[PDB]
Design a protein around this ligand. Sequence first.
Ligand SMILES: COc1ccc(C2=NNC(=O)/C2=N/Nc2ccc(Cl)cc2)cc1OC
Length: 336
Amino acid sequence: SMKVSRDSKVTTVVATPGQGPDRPQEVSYTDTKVIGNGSFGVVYQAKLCDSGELVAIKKVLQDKRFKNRELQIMRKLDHCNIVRLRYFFYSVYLNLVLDYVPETVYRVARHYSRAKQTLPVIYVKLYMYQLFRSLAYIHSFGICHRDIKPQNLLLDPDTAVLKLCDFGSAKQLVRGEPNVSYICSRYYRAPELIFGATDYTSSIDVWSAGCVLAELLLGQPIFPGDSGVDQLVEIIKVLGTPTREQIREMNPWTKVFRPRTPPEAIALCSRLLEYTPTARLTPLEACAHSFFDELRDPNVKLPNGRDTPALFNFTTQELSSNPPLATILIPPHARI
Ligand SMILES: COc1ccc(C2=NNC(=O)/C2=N/Nc2ccc(Cl)cc2)cc1OC
């Protein structure tokens, strides 16, 4: 139940806070507009009446038979690199009231691509590092996103802040439980998914992140193809034919990129984009990679003088996979 009034058309809903105790809130918003569509449902941009603050409203069809998995997952998440679930309410449709983020890596990468240019490496570092942090965080709960792609990576152009969104495919992966191989989008799918594996791990997200990194470096997807076969061919052309052992596990890099591509960017890709799922860097190990060393420099600034967003406020939860990595991850200047 919602109420409509005119101050300008105003919608007043009684919504449940995304986190904390269930204390219903009256939320009034106006100036709604569609910012995105998809198979899930629609995404709107709305303005909160009282604060003038912009929010995004993701509205999806609600199955009465079960609780929404995306909602349940998002209610438990609290990270600087994950879009925040402020409130949720019903219309049946589930409406997720999230923080509003102006851009996506997809649109940004496309602006550059169309202009035959490349995103400055400083932004590639900042975006990728933040993506790996969000993954280290979700994976620490055993949650695999399963659909990492530029359209699911939100970004604030001015603050250089990246936020992971779209938890509609996300799932807690439990050893011994099979999972569907038909998740994950064309050009971002790990080879084990292409091969039809149901015993895959969270490392599928690392492969997808490597595809995004390579795409930001190249200006186009690194493994295109409209079919699995075409995708595998593109993969084989770079990684070489997988060995019999590599197939069982799944169940020239320097020449790939433009001349002045930093060697550390290339090395990072080669460690993300590996056939053997267990051989891939974990997100936290990716964060600690030397390609991100510039971000740990005490004098680093955004091109426009502004400060970099928060990068070292790691929690114990976040570091749980490998606590000693805090040694690299938290630079001396961040330890006061
Ligand atoms: C489900 O897909 C989502 C899409 C957008 C957002 C989103 N949250 N907060 C925002 O600001 C969002 N913005 N989305 C968006 C979409 C398109 C453009 Cl071009 C810009 C922003 C969140 C989603 O999942 C929860």
